[PDB]
Design a protein around this ligand. Structure first.
Ligand SMILES: CCCCC[C@H](S)C(=O)N[C@@H](Cc1ccccc1)C(=O)N[C@@H](C)C(=O)O
Ligand SMILES: [Ca+2]
Ligand SMILES: [Ca+2]
Ligand SMILES: [Ca+2]
Ligand SMILES: [Ca+2]
Ligand SMILES: [Zn+2]
Length: 316
């Protein structure tokens, strides 16, 4: 919409107050003109037609319960955009400031969120398993990272390339969470998962097994469920990333951590320069090793840690 850029105020899913960039033209719209070609948030109104209506509000104040998921989706998309721009020098998901669109209130009691190849979509959850999914910054960052992957590696969403695709989204979803410094951790979905249970999460990068996911290649899922286990086998790569960054001993193999910033640098380089649509775990290892070499030299500790971490999870 064409209008005047302004700043509204609202309350997110978790009840936190935050300012949001809006656009004024009769109504105040959830349209952020300060980042690239814009961030647009839509109301799917409990239906499945996308994107729905660009979010319109009469007074630029978003404190209604219906508003919460929109506020967070809009706000976190902005934070995610800043992360990629500031940390990786990437302008939006396509690298050329493509408009970022998100739709909230998708369907009824929908326990998921996803990138559909064109935009991000967020369900409200059923109130038991999940609350509105945009309330989690690792969720929002996970979805937008899928867009980055679409325009770079193009990892096919099935089997090993699919598990890599998922892991990259969890890895960057986590790095964005640390970046915003929003009670950061190496857990996935803790802010919106199971409102009745404290201390849990959907997945864990530090200890995937905690939630039944493999933490070693020998325990990989080989069936056809979940597109060949894309949300299951991602645990193997998530664990490796966690080890590269934080260090630790896993299955008797010791890894010296090199930190989050270097983890992000290595993986971003692998994703954008070396990964292809059909890359498997073994190729991811080679890509990560090559990236760390380009950035830190063949005899660097960084290259050594990447090797140890993949050895620890059994990926040669
Ligand atoms: C319906 C199609 C779903 C395809 C997969 C989407 S990208 C996805 O992975 N969504 C995330 C949402 C998420 C992200 C981070 C934290 C919590 C929840 C996801 O992991 N969904 C799980 C529930 C799944 O699809 O198995
Ligand atoms: Ca209002
Ligand atoms: Ca957290
Ligand atoms: Ca988290
Ligand atoms: Ca919970
Ligand atoms: Zn995903």
């Amino acid at each position: 919409i064409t209008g005047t850029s302004t700043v509204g105020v609202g309350r997110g899913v978790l009840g936190d107050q935050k300012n949001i960039n809006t656009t004024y033209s009769t109504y105040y719209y959830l349209q952020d003109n300060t980042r690239g070609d814009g961030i647009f948030t839509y109301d799917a109104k409990y239906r499945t037609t996308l994107p729905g209506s660009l979010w319109a509000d009469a007074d630029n104040q978003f404190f209604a319960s219906y508003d919460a998921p929109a506020v967070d989706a809009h706000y976190y998309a902005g934070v995610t955009y800043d992360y990629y721009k500031n940390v990786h020098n990437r302008l939006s998901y396509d690298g050329n400031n493509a408009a970022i669109r998100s739709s909230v209130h998708y369907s009824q009691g929908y326990n998921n969120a996803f990138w559909n190849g064109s935009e991000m979509v967020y369900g409200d959850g059923d109130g038991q398993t999940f609350i509105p999914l945009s309330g989690g910054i690792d969720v929002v960052a996970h979805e937008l990272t899928h867009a980055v992957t679409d325009y770079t590696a193009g990892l096919i969403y099935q089997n090993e390339s699919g598990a890599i695709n998922e892991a990259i989204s969890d890895i960057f979803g986590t790095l964005v969470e640390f970046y915003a410094n929003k009670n950061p951790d190496w857990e996935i979905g803790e802010d919106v998962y199971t409102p009745g249970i404290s201390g849990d999460s959907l997945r864990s990068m530090s200890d995937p097994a905690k939630y039944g996911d493999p933490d070693h290649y020998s325990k990989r899922y080989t069936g056809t469920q979940d597109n060949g286990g894309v949300h299951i086998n991602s645990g193997i790569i998530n664990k490796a990333a966690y080890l590269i960054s934080q260090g630790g001993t896993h299955y008797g193999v010791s890894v010296v951590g090199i930190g989050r910033d270097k983890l992000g640098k290595i993986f971003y380089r692998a994703l954008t320069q070396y990964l292809t649509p059909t890359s498997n775990f073994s190729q991811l290892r080679a890509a990560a090793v090559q990236s760390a070499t380009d950035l830190y030299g063949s005899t660097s500790q960084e290259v050594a840690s990447v090797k140890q971490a993949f050895d620890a999870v059994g990926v040669k």
